[PDB]
């Protein structure tokens, strides 16, 4: 694992040509099938996906997956969770190469395998234990009710509920990639628009209450599912456009508030997470009609996010907690920025959308009327005001102040001041 640690020294750092050289000699220090070698075999698979100039559809990539899954079925045949770390490395593989509908199948098979890993009993004798109970015992119970199991069914654990979060990640990202690519009409018909949204909501549902059972409802990992279930509901209402979802918006802002309180007390007030457990709460409260609590909270976003930009650009780094990040422990941090917080930077300026004043009926009408992946994280910087990829990740001070003043003059401001204005 020492040679594999310098392998990790070259994966994150874009020194791929060296990383190929000591990875081939690392596998000589393991016996032939020997499922303990799956750490090296998957790291080589990460080199050939990220590190070589060949695209993401090589026959090398399916050969390495098949050769490592073969080694699990040789040593620890379908009875060790290195089958699951093959199913998460393969899920990362095709998450890079598009096809998010297929990535749902990969994580589905990861959930089905992990169900057999945990195991269940059948209890075929429940009818005849009831026959003994109705003969010996003295209750009304064993005659008009079937006998329950002696020990109930199993708990969804930490990792298998992680695959629930990843399945909701594939479903929501498939929904919104076609939403930002609506130019082709054969992308997610409106019947499927409600269906994949509300069941990515159900997968984030399941991950949240499995986590507060195991780790308790105060750890960062529960807060991540609670904030993301609120975000998934916000996209569920937007896609369906159903007016009966006022029950859903109540539990959405009530999930975002619980995520906000803990994230203030765990990550501070200047952090990429704590700015959008308040920013999403700003959209879900202005959703309800609370146009001054959402106002003052969006007000608070561009105070603490601005104070975050006071800090050193070298001292602003966020790696999202995610089961891909835990399994693929060594990668550049930029490889997971896409999934839900450029989502926030797109939805936030577009959701409110007033226009239709002059500069829209004047700067459009009159203007048209006149005629005749080798990407390392940036380690060394140039000046104190550089641009971290975590700064693109959050919406800029230009465009979220933009939403702020648009809230005021349209549906904010007390009756006194807008009287004095007009």
């Amino acid at each position: 694992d020492a040679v594999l640690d310098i392998v990790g020294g070259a994966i994150r750092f874009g020194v791929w040509k060296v990383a190929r050289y000591l990875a081939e000699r690392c596998l000589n220090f393991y016996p032939e099938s020997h499922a303990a070698a799956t750490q090296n075999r998957l790291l080589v698979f990460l080199i050939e996906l990220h590190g070589s100039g060949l695209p993401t559809s090589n026959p090398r990539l399916v050969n390495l997956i098949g050769a490592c899954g073969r080694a699990i079925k040789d040593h620890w045949e379908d009875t060790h969770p290195v089958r699951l770390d093959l199913l998460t490395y393969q899920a990362w593989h095709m998450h890079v190469s598009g096809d998010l509908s297929e990535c749902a199948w990969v994580l589905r098979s990861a959930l089905t395998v992990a169900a057999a890993m945990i195991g269940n009993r059948n209890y075929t004798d429940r009818n005849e234990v009831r026959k003994l109970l109705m003969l010996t015992s003295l209750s009304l119970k064993p005659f008009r009710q079937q006998l329950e199991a002696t020990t109930p069914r199993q708990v969804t654990n930490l990792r298998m509920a992680g695959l629930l979060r990843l399945l909701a990640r594939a479903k929501l990202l498939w929904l919104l990639d076609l939403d930002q690519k609506r130019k082709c009409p054969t992308f997610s018909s409106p019947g499927n628009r409600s269906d994949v949204a509300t069941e990515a909501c159900n997968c984030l549902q399941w991950a949240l209450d499995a986590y507060d059972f195991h780790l308790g409802s105060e750890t960062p990992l529960t807060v991540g599912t609670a904030y993301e279930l609120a975000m998934a509901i916000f996209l569920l209402r937007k896609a369906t456009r159903s007016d009966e979802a006022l029950l859903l918006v109540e539990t959405a802002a009530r999930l975002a508030e619980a995520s906000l309180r803990v994230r203030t007390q765990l990550f501070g007030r200047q952090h990429v997470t704590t700015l959008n457990t308040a920013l999403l709460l700003g959209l879900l409260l202005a959703d309800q009609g609370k146009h001054r609590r959402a106002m003052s909270l969006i007000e608070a976003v561009i105070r603490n996010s601005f104070i975050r930009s006071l800090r050193s650009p070298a001292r602003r780094r966020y790696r999202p907690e995610d089961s891909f990040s835990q399994t693929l422990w060594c990668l550049p941090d930029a490889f997971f920025y896409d999934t839900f917080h450029t989502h926030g930077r797109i939805i936030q300026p577009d959701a409110l959308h007033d226009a239709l004043l002059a500069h829209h009926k004047r700067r459009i009408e009159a203007a048209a009327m006149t005629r005749r992946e080798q990407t390392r994280d940036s380690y060394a910087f140039l000046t104190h005001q550089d641009e971290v990829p975590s700064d693109h990740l959050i919406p800029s001070i230009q465009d979220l102040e933009e939403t702020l003043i648009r809230i005021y003059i349209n549906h904010g401001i007390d009756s006194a001041l807008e009287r004095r204005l007009c």
């Binding site: 009993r121 002696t150 020990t151 109930p152 708990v155």
Partner: protein, 50 residues
């Protein structure tokens, strides 16, 4: 959850102990039933030859 674990070991002990206890007897019953049914079938053939 650990309470259900120490009862689940009791269930697996009971099923493993009754599987090899019933293994000898139920094999012998099916062997004796094979003898009755083969010998009665062989007697039905001699009645046909009769």
């Amino acid at each position: 959850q650990r309470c259900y674990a120490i009862l689940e070991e009791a269930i697996t002990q009971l099923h493993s102990c009754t599987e090899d206890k019933m293994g000898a007897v139920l094999s012998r019953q099916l062997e004796l039933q094979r003898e009755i049914d083969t010998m009665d079938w062989s007697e039905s053939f001699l009645q046909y030859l009769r």
